[PDB]
Design a protein around this ligand. Structure first.
Ligand code: HEM
Length: 137
């Protein structure tokens, strides 16, 4: 289920983080606006860049912690607040995070693995709600 999925993702986090983030950037190319440094690069190019690798893995590091601290796929208010008040996210709306979670769910549905896609989908909605409550537009 959800908790095991966390363990699975963490067992190969760098690879999962990159592949899910690339699936996000490719599904929603207009989302490349928030990452100027990534424009005009194939997936392999993006993976060569140390920053892509760095940033993305740190995103998933924190995502998995938020997932880990959730109850029944409902994240802590404190975690949502942190994500909203992060300066790197000054630009973002919950639509940005929605899209990330649609691509993550899709990724999981298309994997051969028994991910609990429905829980991640609930988790994504719950987080979007919690980001709203914590003041993200
Ligand atoms: C659960 C969801 C998310 C988590 C846990 C998260 C976490 C993080 C973390 C930890 C960093 C800092 C990494 C560093 O210091 O280098 C970061 C930076 C950033 N995040 Fe997020 N993030 C999430 C969703 C998003 C989404 C949906 C977007 C845009 C649609 C976004 C855009 C960014 C940007 C633009 C940066 C700075 C860019 C850079 O220098 O590479 N994040 N995020």
């Amino acid at each position: 289920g959800f908790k095991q999925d966390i363990a699975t993702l963490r067992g190969d986090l760098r690879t999962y983080a990159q592949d899910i983030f690339l699936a996000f950037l490719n599904k929603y190319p207009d989302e490349k606006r928030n990452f100027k440094n990534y424009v005009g690069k194939s997936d392999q190019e993006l993976k060569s860049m140390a920053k892509f690798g760095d940033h993305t893995e740190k995103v998933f590091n924190l995502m998995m912690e938020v997932a880990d601290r959730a109850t029944d796929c409902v994240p802590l208010a404190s975690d949502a607040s942190t994500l909203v008040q992060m300066k790197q996210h000054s630009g973002l709306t919950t639509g940005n995070f929605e899209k990330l979670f649609v691509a993550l769910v899709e990724y999981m549905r298309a994997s051969g693995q028994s991910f609990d896609s429905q829980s991640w989908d609930r988790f994504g909605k719950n987080l979007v709600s919690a980001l709203s409550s914590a003041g993200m537009k």
